[PDB]
Ligand binder design. Sequence first.
Ligand code: G2P
Ligand code: MG
Ligand code: MG
Ligand code: ZN
Ligand code: ZN
Ligand code: ZN
Lengths: 559, 159, 266, 196, 84, 133, 65, 114, 141, 43, 102
Amino acid sequence: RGNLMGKRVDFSARTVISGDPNLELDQVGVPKSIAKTLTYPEVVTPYNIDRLTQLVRNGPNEHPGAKYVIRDSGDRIDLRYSKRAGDIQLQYGWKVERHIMDNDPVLFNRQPSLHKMSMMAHRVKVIPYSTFRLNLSVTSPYNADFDGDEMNLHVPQSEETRAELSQLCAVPLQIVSPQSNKPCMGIVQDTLCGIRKLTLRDTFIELDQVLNMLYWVPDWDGVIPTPAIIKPKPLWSGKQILSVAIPNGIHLQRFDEGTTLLSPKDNGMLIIDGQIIFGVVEKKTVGSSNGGLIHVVTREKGPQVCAKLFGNIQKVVNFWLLHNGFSTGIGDTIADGPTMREITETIAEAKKKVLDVTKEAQANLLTAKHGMTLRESFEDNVVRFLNEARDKAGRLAEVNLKDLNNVKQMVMAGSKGSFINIAQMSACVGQQSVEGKRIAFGFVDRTLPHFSKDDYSPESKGFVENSYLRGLTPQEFFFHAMGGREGLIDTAVKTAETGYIQRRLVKALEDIMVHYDNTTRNSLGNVIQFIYGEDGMDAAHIEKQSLDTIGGSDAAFEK
Amino acid sequence: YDRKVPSPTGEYVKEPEWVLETDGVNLSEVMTVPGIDPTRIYTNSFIDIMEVLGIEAGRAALYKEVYNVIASDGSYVNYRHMALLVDVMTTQGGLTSVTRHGFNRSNTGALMRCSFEETVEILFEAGASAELDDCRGVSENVILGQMAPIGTGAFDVMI
Amino acid sequence: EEGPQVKIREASKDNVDFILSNVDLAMANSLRRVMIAEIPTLAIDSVEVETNTTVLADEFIAHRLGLIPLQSMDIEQLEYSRDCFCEDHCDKCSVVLTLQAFGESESTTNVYSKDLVIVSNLMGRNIGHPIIQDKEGNGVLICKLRKGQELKLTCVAKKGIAKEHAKWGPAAAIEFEYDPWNKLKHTDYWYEQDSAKEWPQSKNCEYEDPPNEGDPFDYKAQADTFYMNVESVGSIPVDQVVVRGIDTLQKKVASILLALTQMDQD
Amino acid sequence: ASRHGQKGTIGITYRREDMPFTAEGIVPDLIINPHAIPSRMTVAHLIECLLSKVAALSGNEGDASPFTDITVEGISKLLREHGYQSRGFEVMYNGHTGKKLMAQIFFGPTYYQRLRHMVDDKIHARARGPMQVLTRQPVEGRSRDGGLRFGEMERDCMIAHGAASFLKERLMEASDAFRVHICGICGLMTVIAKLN
Amino acid sequence: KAIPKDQRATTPYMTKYERARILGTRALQISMNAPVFVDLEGETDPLRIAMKELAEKKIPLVIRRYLPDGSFEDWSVEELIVDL
Amino acid sequence: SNTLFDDIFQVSEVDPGRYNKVCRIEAASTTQDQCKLTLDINVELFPVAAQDSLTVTIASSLTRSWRPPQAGDRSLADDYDYVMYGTAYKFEEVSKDLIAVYYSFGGLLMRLEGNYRNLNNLKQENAYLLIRR
Amino acid sequence: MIVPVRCFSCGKVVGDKWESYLNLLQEDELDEGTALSRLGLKRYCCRRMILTHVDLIEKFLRYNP
Amino acid sequence: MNAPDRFELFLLGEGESKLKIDPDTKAPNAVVITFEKEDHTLGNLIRAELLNDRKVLFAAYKVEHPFFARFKLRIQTTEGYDPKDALKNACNSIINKLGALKTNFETEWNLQTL
Amino acid sequence: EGLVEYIDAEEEESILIAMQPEDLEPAEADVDPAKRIRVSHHATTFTHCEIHPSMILGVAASIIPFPDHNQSPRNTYQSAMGKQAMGVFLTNYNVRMDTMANILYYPQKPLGTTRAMEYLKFRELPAGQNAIVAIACYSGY
Amino acid sequence: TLSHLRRTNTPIAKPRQLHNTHWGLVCPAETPEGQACGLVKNL
Amino acid sequence: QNAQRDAVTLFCCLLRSRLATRRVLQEYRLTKQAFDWVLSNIEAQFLRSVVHPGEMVGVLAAQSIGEPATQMTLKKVTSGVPRLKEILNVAKNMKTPSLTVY
RNA sequence: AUGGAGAGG
Ligand SMILES: Nc1nc2c(ncn2[C@@H]2O[C@H](COP(=O)(O)CP(=O)(O)OP(=O)(O)O)[C@@H](O)[C@H]2O)c(=O)[nH]1
Ligand SMILES: [Mg+2]
Ligand SMILES: [Mg+2]
Ligand SMILES: [Zn+2]
Ligand SMILES: [Zn+2]
Ligand SMILES: [Zn+2]
């Protein structure tokens, strides 16, 4: 396992990675210093000898140049320390170990390498500064952020071995993935948050700004589209210039809820050939969903055009967002005066309700639900009552947050954050929990030495009444800490166990492939499936279409 | 439980039934019980389904189970994968675990099995039994440093 | 005079609060940028150190030296060392200055920028003298010495641009504001109950007319008036930061013009 | 990293001019994304900012001690008597263009800490180089000018892709390819190849 | 022994692994200045050539597809459909 | 070509649907009793109170890139107050004697309902919707 | 360490302000906010440069060598 | 360690012309100038003034990567009007406003006290 | 003078601790809607009183401002990272010969502090500067 | 440093969970993540 | 030929449900030269959609289950990671046996 | 080469 199934290897590199609004999807920013260290053996041929000679000339510093040379006999001429580094006359059939250059194909990697999309061939772009750069939208298959993560890079040595990367491993041709028969890359974070911003019915753009956005898309035909608004002023709707990014013959229809084709709420989505007709663009469209823009554009126009599509959308939305701006204060976690008073009295009517049930169960008038201990029912009820209290006060708060509320808008776009986030920050953090139950009695018959014994009250067993905004108290803090720790402990432990399951899985299905009779087998030729997946298809090329023979009145089926 | 079923008139409808949920398992005997539909009874214990209703019913159950782990988590993996997993545990005849007790006995290449779990004891009684290695396993060619019969290495090129 | 229009409100050695009427947004902006990063200045940019038995590290000192504001009034008649034909530095392109400090007293001996001593030939040019707005005449506290401590070093001040390092930055702060009633709706005010009661009133609201609810949105209007305040470090008087700013911007617009003629040749 | 689990690295540096700016000429030393805020519920960071700004203006020391009666309301009233908008917002102007920002930005002081983890301390690339004696494979470690390890988890990823020749290359021409002689009979590396 | 050219059961289309290995092998041949059977047009890149050299079916390599039992079908790159 | 449709409508409903630059408008024709109109209006440009009455036309002229408003000498083809250019996406059949058309002016929406209209409306691309007051 | 030659944010020169600050404090009993205002440190970007600063040099000189 | 020198923002390099003019292939009578060693300071000023010339159909600039001090200006003019002249009149126009701005500021300064 | 005792975990088991001194009566005996919700002195039988609740924390968490307004694991993360923050680790750094030493050019006492920072000497030997910082999407970098 | 002098080690049924009794003796928050989480403690 | 008819079954249901005469002519309003194309595409698209021989399809399946299993973290049954670990181990003695009775 | 400790995603 240490020296055979896996071996330390030459032509490799590692560094801190960072994001780049301006690299193209399939690119990889390579620091110059690394480009100058990694080599490719390139053979001297009539087509390259001019550039190749120049490279040797430029020596091994700085890019772009070359380290060494390989003669007929197979000796190793070194550009660093050689009395002939200046005048070497390249023979056809010689090897020139040159630097890694722009548009070289390199295997890019982040560990742990769980699925195939963790090793994707990128196109090299040598850049300044010491970090590998990638496009945010390649973030996800890598599970990579920029809080310190490092990534590896391997450089192919032979002509075929590069073929193998660019034809099999290239980032565009991984966009739609056999894993979940969907796209595994989408529009994230800023771009995502802003693309919704950009496409509200209130979002209009005047001429100056439109022409930049227009010029920002490389594939722009250079035809100013007619402004949605003309008299008496040309305002161009957000939806309009974003459409410039989307190709032709790209049809898309999405009815999301109250969508009724007037979209009184700009719901759903409708893109009649490369122009969007109605609806705010957010996660369900331009995310890595199933019946969304990326899935369509890949299948319809190809990976290349789709990979190109990532850049274009980011280039516009980012520009538009850069001059619109977006932020988040603590003002975004303040709920109304009224809403606060309601939230409090809400929390109380559940504290008063647990009180009763407790008082009741103490008088022996509580009846155990079939198949459970008397105490079990009591816990179950109180936990439900307090959970309900939270969700109720959360929703209470969420309704009072305006549309200009920043936390809401990220949740709206689908950028980051959810109901509970809003809930706990502004209304009530809720009930703490270890091993599935509320906070135990560590000391005898009580939970902390500041309580009297036998205290099953909500505060005493770990109900944080307060919100993060308002501030946890001593006991609250301590309990919240108790729960929090469990998280860490089994996060730590989930990473351990998962990493084993995987290794085992993989080693067990390792030699299973589809042979040239569509028959899935193994090293022994044992049939596992007679037709791969019972239908012979590859999972990338597969989408969720409704079989509409299945439903409806026999009557309407006839009609 | 709520249940979708065909109307007399064709459309599907919500016609909610009563369902009994159990702590514990004796499938052998609760299905023979009078009063219940013995055609739809179920355990989360695919290990019993395999025993009572047969290997193929088990395969279908083992998948149903694996599936439910993913989907409960929100997720959604395509059916061909989990199927391959299931089917692989299943083709031996019964439930073959994904451990050294399961798949790592199955008379495949000696070098292949030695690359997982029992590393030397495999290599040893492979020497005693004087085994022969096809060398068509992936991991054997990894060791030998030859191009493995995988994808681009699944065929031959000539003139 | 004719186009763009200036109106000083307050003036001082250090500040010029003014109003820049009748200009593009673009221009009034491009001017502030230039004022920040592109009017040249002299500042220490090399330190050869002879002795430093001080508590601080060599380069740590060297650093502070760079930050000390040197007179850059006659800077336009000093040269870029990169330009000048001498090898390394000279008297046309660089002021050299000396720093000697030794702790004599029992008490802590301080080292100020007054202790800087010009040495190269200024030849009349008004240049290189450390700016001192300090009240007791020792601007900037370079370093502190204990008893036996010595510090002996030599600094070659060069002409530089703030783009290259923020030491050569003539501007400190450049206040900047337009449309103080959002009459152009260039922001959308975040609020809780009331935009008006919650966001405080800009001082530049006594200068414009509040909108009327009886009026609808003026959509044709553009950004016209601009309320700036340039504050200067002192290596160049205030008035000059703005002027030389306008000068430099104009100067670089020009080299673009000239560059178009350079290409026309056959 | 700020004082609350919000860690992160630099991606770019902008000079004052390109930075967004307050109407009093204030400019940030630092810009963090609003997306680090709502899922990690680090409200403290947000409050420290608010307190810190008041501390700076008022010239007092912001008490951010835990269990006390300090309150986002009380702080906000204080910051209001200081003329700024009470929840930390400030109209900012784009630096590229001079235009206002549509949004107002949460802007203030916030104790940030530089961590021992620097780029120039991690960077490493290796083409060919040292080779351990025993195994004749690349030595381990940056500090030793070694090769990164093509793990099994990587080996599988290549297998998935179907990249056969690459997988061979990674495990032969990089790392430890080697040539032996066998016997047409036994099959062991027993031969005494008197080469030449 | 071998298999009849008629009764060839496998896909008449070219697998993506066939294509990558074909382009790879030719680009390796081109790489070492073996002769090139196209117009070039200014394509100096050994992979870009084999791609154009394949687009015109002017690649004289043959595929030996292996069946699990040791059988095998031969297909010319000349005749394999390339729709991908 | 020429005109496509022209009527005079009376506004019954104006709706700031959580917006401050756009209203969903509801109008009926003061001539045909089988004719209503739903329209998304930039109220920050051309404000529209309830009970107003707006002259409405659909014309397709006055595609090459939009030169700025060099109408200095050209033919503005309007003298109206408010003018958008949209797309027709759906044509809906309500009744053997009724027809509805669906317009998108940069995602501002328009639904028109009437019967003889069918003898005029094309399936895009053009259609400059002009309003007066 | 020692006062800052200049404020990081704006660029203003705060290095000549240190002693004058310490005097305004102790000599005439002012409070740090007032003291900081008399030094004409208005904007809080450069105001915290002085208030938040710690003079570790006073400790460093303590060592004989 | 991998950082470019800071002069590289305003100093031109080994044979880098200041302007580079290319015929836009998309739309007719359009051109795309590359400005090495310049930024939003220039570009935004040229593009905003080109927007006042009523024979300019299209005008927009862009910094394709902040790492590099450079930007592209794209200009389309009406038939017969060569775009370079549209740039030339544009620059000059600015220079005249700037001059007027300078003198107007000076006279204002010469009236003050303190 | 018996005003203050020492309790270990075991004897802790047998006592009733008040969290706030005033929690004694005191005697009690309209509100601010913005303060956090505090239960009451419902146990009128104490034996001891907590010195101050903030003392539940160790040396690292004692550095975090408002930690009682944070999701608990973030507080833990800080507690790991604070040990990797650069600053003045000792005043005698010029006379020590450590293999690796990092000192901040201009360390700064944080604008928002903690009473427990006082005994921790953090104000005197800080590690961190008070950056002027904007939360905003800007260039998307 | 201050930290490292007030550290706790605990070798090898729920030893990692921040236990009630820890109130006032061990810090709730301060502990390594991953392997030694809840085993290494600080006073 | 029976495997082939089988493999294709479910797809053709979709095919016949959509390419059925009443619908082609009344819902879509297709023609000939255009309807022949719709047939043509579908043929091609389909042939593309087939899995390519030599695809390592196991490693793909193991990874496709493994990876999202690493995203599983939190009332009756054992779920998530522990449940998975029960399943692959063929747990003789599972933690939440149960019958569901209809 | 052993062995060990702390830390990174
Ligand atoms: N296989 C392992 N991966 C690890 C381990 N520790 C960290 N990681 C990886 O780090 C990735 C993200 O974890 P982080 O280090 O950012 C900690 P955490 O999950 O709390 O971060 P957030 O996603 O912000 O919640 C995770 O997907 C793994 O790939 C480990 O011990 N084993
Ligand atoms: Mg993570
Ligand atoms: Mg990370
Ligand atoms: Zn000189
Ligand atoms: Zn032999
Ligand atoms: Zn400042």
